[PDB]
């Protein structure tokens, strides 16, 4: 294993593992976004009922 | 009073746009993951 | 061996695309925030 | 404060507060993305040096 070979390996492994983290973090953003949408919808329908 | 209702509708439609953009980010992320994984395996094979 | 290098270049360019898309999500988020804040204030004023 | 008025208020306040959370969560994703980019760049330059 040359220096460049090992580095390429470290880099690919880290990226493989960090993309799973990013995906999981996206799941969390989607949950917030959906809750924001449901609140926005109740907000709109409350405003419609007012005016 | 007509504008508070136009504002609420606008916020509702922007959250729909958010959702769509997140799904496109997620597609890019899984593609990156799949390529990272392929490259890793074929590196772990050769070295 | 020519394809491991084409793969690495592709992963690098996809992370640049990721960054750009995140900035566009962030623009949408701050806009949503600014409208949410305006609506809140003008509601807290009227009621 | 009518029922619809209060709801509109709750909804707008929650959305105001949740958008700050989303923004902060985006800051975290950007940090991961930049680290992914730096690793991808080292990966590429390591591969160039190899081949």
UniProtKB/Swiss-Prot annotation, chains A, D:
SUPFAM superfamilies: ROP protein. GO terms for molecular function: identical protein binding. Disulfide bonds: none annotated. Pfam families: Rop (PF01815). Keywords: Plasmid, Transcription, Transcription regulation. It comes from the Bacteria. InterPro entries: Regulatory_Rop, Rop-like_sf. Regulates plasmid DNA replication by modulating the initiation of transcription of the primer RNA precursor. Processing of the precursor of the primer, RNAII, is inhibited by hydrogen bonding of RNAII to its complementary sequence in RNAI. ROP increases the affinity of RNAI for RNAII and thus decreases the rate of replication initiation events. Antiparallel homodimer. This is Regulatory protein rop. It comes from Escherichia coli. The lineage of its organism: Bacteria, Pseudomonadati, Pseudomonadota, Gammaproteobacteria, Enterobacterales.
Swiss-Prot record, chains B, C:
Antiparallel homodimer. The keyword Transcription applies. GO terms for molecular function: identical protein binding. Keywords: Plasmid, Transcription, Transcription regulation. It comes from the Bacteria. The chain holds residues 5 to 56 of 63 of the full protein. This is Regulatory protein rop. Signal peptide: none annotated. Regulates plasmid DNA replication by modulating the initiation of transcription of the primer RNA precursor. Processing of the precursor of the primer, RNAII, is inhibited by hydrogen bonding of RNAII to its complementary sequence in RNAI. ROP increases the affinity of RNAI for RNAII and thus decreases the rate of replication initiation events. Disulfide bonds: none annotated.
């Amino acid at each position: 294993m040359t220096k460049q070979e090992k580095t390429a390996l470290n880099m690919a492994r880290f990226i493989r593992s960090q993309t799973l983290t990013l995906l999981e973090k996206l799941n969390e953003l989607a949950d917030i976004c959906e809750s924001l949408h449901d609140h926005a919808d109740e907000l709109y329908r409350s405003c419609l009922a007012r005016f």
